[PDB]
Amino acid sequence: VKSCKGRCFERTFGNCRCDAACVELGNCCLDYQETCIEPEHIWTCNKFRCGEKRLTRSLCACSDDCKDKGDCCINYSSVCQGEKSWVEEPCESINEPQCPAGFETPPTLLFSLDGFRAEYLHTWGGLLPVISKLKKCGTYTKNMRPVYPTKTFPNHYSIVTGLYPESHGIIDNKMYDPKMNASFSLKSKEKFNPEWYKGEPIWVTAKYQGLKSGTFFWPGSDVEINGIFPDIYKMYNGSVPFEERILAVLQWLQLPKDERPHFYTLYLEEPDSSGHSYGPVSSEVIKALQRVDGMVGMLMDGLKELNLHRCLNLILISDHGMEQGSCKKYIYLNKYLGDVKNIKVIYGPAARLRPSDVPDKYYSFNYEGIARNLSCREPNQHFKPYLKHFLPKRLHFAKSDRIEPLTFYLDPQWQLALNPSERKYCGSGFHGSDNVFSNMQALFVGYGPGFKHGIEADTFENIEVYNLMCDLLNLTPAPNNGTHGSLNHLLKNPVYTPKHPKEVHPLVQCPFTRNPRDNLGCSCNPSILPIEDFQTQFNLTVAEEKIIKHETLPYGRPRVLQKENTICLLSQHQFMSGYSQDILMPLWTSYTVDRNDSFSTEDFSNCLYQDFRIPLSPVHKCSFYKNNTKVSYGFLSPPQLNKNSSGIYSEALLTTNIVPMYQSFQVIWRYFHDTLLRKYAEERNGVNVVSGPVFDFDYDGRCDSLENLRQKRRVIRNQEILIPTHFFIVLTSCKDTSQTPLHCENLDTLAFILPHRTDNSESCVHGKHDSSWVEELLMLHRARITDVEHITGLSFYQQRKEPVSDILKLKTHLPTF
Ligand SMILES: *[C@@H]1O[C@H](CO)[C@@H](O[C@@H]2O[C@H](CO)[C@@H](O[C@@H]3O[C@H](CO)[C@@H](O)[C@H](O[C@@H]4O[C@H](CO)[C@@H](O)[C@H](O)[C@@H]4O)[C@@H]3O)[C@H](O)[C@H]2NC(C)=O)[C@H](O)[C@H]1NC(C)=O
Ligand SMILES: *[C@@H]1O[C@H](CO)[C@@H](O[C@@H]2O[C@H](CO)[C@@H](O[C@H]3O[C@H](CO)[C@@H](O)[C@H](O)[C@@H]3O)[C@H](O)[C@H]2NC(C)=O)[C@H](O)[C@H]1NC(C)=O
Ligand SMILES: *[C@@H]1O[C@H](CO)[C@@H](O[C@@H]2O[C@H](CO)[C@@H](O)[C@H](O)[C@H]2NC(C)=O)[C@H](O)[C@H]1NC(C)=O
Ligand SMILES: COc1ccc2c(Oc3ccc(NS(N)(=O)=O)cc3)ccnc2c1
Ligand SMILES: *[C@@H]1O[C@H](CO)[C@@H](O)[C@H](O)[C@H]1NC(C)=O
Ligand SMILES: *[C@@H]1O[C@H](CO)[C@@H](O)[C@H](O)[C@H]1NC(C)=O
Ligand SMILES: [Zn+2]
Ligand SMILES: [Zn+2]
């Protein structure tokens, strides 16, 4: 008499009412809403609904017959039969997958929570029980590094292609292509134009190898790519409630095996939506995090009902993080340029500049002009104009013609526009900043038979996930920017065992040739002890060679993977090197600074000794460089480093150990070898060094072919000289500072690809100590060893006893401080 249970919408006499008219009269039963109305709007059972008379308008049922008719709400068993929800069960390991026929290869589901920054789980884990249990029972990283720019379409498409945006063509949510003379927008018909989307998304990879795919939203999944759609896909519609998306995927997993997909996707707009609207630290973001946690729980409860919770490989992921924007942390360019109307500026933290008159002036326009106009205009300026090829190589943001030739690099929390009118609310949450900023780091949790249990992996990049998903589905990956095997440590049973790459040609021989001691035009410091008998000093016993090889190449010599190359090994007492006769320059030197080594202050300028192992060339003579305004030279292995004396190491002054070097770059190079290298050596109990030139004239992150290098030589004093685009450095010590670089159990690495520029305008030098700015520039231009490998065509560490996959893990690491 006091409850609507069983009598929804039936007229009553005397009892509280359960008809629509009761509301206005205020004589409804206490439970009228929960019993009769709520079921039309919710996907959950509760203590009011358990044993309900079936309602015709209810989204799912909590009636006694719901199991038989198979339309129970997902939480029915937990709430109405007192069984445990997935999250309530303790972790148990999934060694053998428990799958139906059709799933001999188990399915993989890629579940994106847009704008879920890694920090949300660090801080709010206690409010997020389901995601917290997936972490506890699964494979987790505190930080997954997204691609630059840290935006939705770029990162989602990178996750399913393993490609940098510069290569997959989706470089932002808004772009212009000058060859197509079209603009890309998420609100335009151009979003569906196949021409934008390059590479091979995993659902295409899967199709070619006999697996069907089912996407409930993913950037690109509603587009015909290489003539292919997913076998099941949805036209984007953000209004579709999360519950309906999850329920649909659970229907696809019940398809008969002939039509049932193996690869699934799920995309939710939260907590990105709430992040923008209310900021990453807000009541709205907390409620949004609890909601997506509940939705993940709904999937797991759903998989459990289907007995697929020990079958399906789930990758819970996000595209990027979220930062608090501020109207006080917004740069407007009109302050420096005036209210000009000939330029269009892409606003945000990944701001870019382009002429209005396109495609006509797209290449011809004076980018360099505005670049110089906007450099070092204030002290502690919060932005930096960069021609795209001068951006740090770690950002891999230049190759595409869709990347405007002038870009801006913004400090954390800072954004940029032309003027206040051409942006949105400045106080909103935002993302797009440098992919190494803490608040831009993303979520990754892997749970299922394929994944290890209770593992916390070191930080990895989302471009590695394509290969991982391919391994989980026994697919052969399309060519991508991931290092295949670098994530084998996440997998119970790795399917791909990587091998170190084999070098194409063997080392050529550079033998001693008797030739006349020639004048090089050098005014050598009298301090330096010249090389009196070369043939004597460099005819080494195999006993003596083995001592040097062990001290300078403790990890093995760099191997050269280039097609056409003639490299030869040069021994010296303190360093080894690979010399290119084809470019008259070493491709790499290797030496080791010990904790108790000496660095000389004695001048060694305009001093060189002839190396009788290679033909003498005009560009190897002090005379070529004497009062030369266009280029100078520098040494790879540092002459300042003496082990046997307290003077200058004479063997380092050989013509074979010099590289063309702009006078402005010498400031950086000197500071590194005089100050920093000594400090590193002390702090780490020694440091092995490998340094060399880099030639990336195509600014594509790859070493240029020898064919291409011929046409890139400059003419200076009627000599053909090849000037490096960058210089690389790779420092290697031990994790354990009790050990020296020659006897490490575990390698601690730190690599740089320093840009080789005619000025130091990048660093805004004037009125600041030399000390500060050089370390700041090194930090900004750090790189993975894998980045160095791709851009030099070298391969390091091939003599380490570690398995290959462990070395790939080490080479793909990027140091964060
Ligand atoms: C990330 O991974 C990417 C995929 O592996 C990789 O990009 C590939 O780069 C190579 C070389 O730049 C591209 O391969 C072709 O190589 C020749 C060079 O001789 C190009 O000329 C050729 O272009 C073409 O032009 C022809 C016109 O006559 C035509 O017949 C061809 O069909 C073709 O259009 C190729 O471009 C390859 O396409 C790239 N793939 C993609 C998807 O971008 C990146 O280098 C790698 N990034 C890093 C930093 O490692
Ligand atoms: C995008 O997804 C939206 C949410 O799924 C969807 O909106 C919803 O569309 C349904 C259509 O059934 C509306 O229901 C209306 O139509 C039925 C059919 O007879 C009648 O009961 C009523 O006239 C009812 O108003 C929902 O009201 C509506 N839901 C919401 C929250 O707006 C869109 O249709 C989807 N598609 C596109 C392309 O926009
Ligand atoms: C490149 O695209 C631009 C912009 O769409 C084109 O410019 C337009 O030209 C038409 C022809 O009279 C006019 O509608 C307008 O002057 C422009 N339209 C807009 C929307 O700005 C241009 O024709 C295209 N082609 C080339 C190669 O320049
Ligand atoms: C079906 O393929 C897709 C998947 C996602 C798409 C998308 O995802 C987004 C949604 C909303 C915001 N804006 S937000 N999260 O602030 O409200 C951004 C990206 C935008 C446009 N098309 C898509 C097609
Ligand atoms: C920068 O260019 C603007 C025009 O866009 C000009 O008015 C201004 O004087 C320039 N500022 C310099 C050169 O510092
Ligand atoms: C030329 O080089 C010498 C030292 O070799 C240097 O002291 C001098 O400044 C330079 N001369 C000119 C013309 O700049
Ligand atoms: Zn996003
Ligand atoms: Zn966003």
Author numbering: 105 to 921
Article passage:
Ectonucleotide pyrophosphatase/phosphodiesterase 1 (ENPP1) is an emerging therapeutic target in human cancers owing to its role in degrading cyclic GMP-AMP (cGAMP), an agonist of the stimulator of interferon genes (STING). Ectonucleotide pyrophosphatase/phosphodiesterase 1 (ENPP1), also known as PC-1, is found as a secreted protein in the extracellular matrix and as a membrane-bound protein intracellularly and on the cell surface. ENPP1 has a role in purin­ergic signalling through the hydrolysis of nucleotide triphosphates (NTPs) and cyclic nucleotides (cNMPs) to their corresponding nucleotide monophosphates (NMPs). Apart from viral poxins, ENPP1 is the only known hydrolase of cyclic GMP-AMP (cGAMP), which is a second messenger generated by cyclic GMP-AMP synthase (cGAS) as an innate immune-system response to double-stranded DNA in the cytosol.
ADU-S100 is a STING agonist that is currently in clinical trials, while QPS2 and Ex54 are published ENPP1 inhibitors. The fused rings of QPS2 and Ex54 occupy the same region as the adenine of AMP but extend further into the pocket, displacing the waters that hydrogen-bond to N6 of AMP. The quin(az)oline projects deeper into the pocket than the adenine ring, making additional interactions with Phe321, Pro323, Asp326 and Tyr371. In the AMP-bound structure, two water molecules are hydrogen-bonded to the N6 position. These are displaced in the QPS2-bound and Ex54-bound structures, and a hydrogen bond between the 7-methoxy group and Trp322 is introduced (3.0–3.2 Å). The methoxy moiety also appears in close contact with the carbonyl of Trp322 (2.4–2.8 Å), which may offset the affinity gains from the introduced hydrogen bond. Ex54 and QPS2 extend out of the adenine pocket via benzene and piperidine rings, respectively, which occupy a similar space to that of the ribose ring of AMP. The sulfamide groups of QPS2/Ex54 do not project towards the zinc site (as per the phosphate of AMP), but instead form hydrogen bonds to Glu373, Asp376 and Ser377. The sulfamide of Ex54 is flipped in the B protomer, projecting towards the bound phosphate, and therefore does not make the above inter­actions. The sulfamide moieties of these inhibitors do not seem to make strong interactions in the catalytic site, unlike the phosphate of AMP.
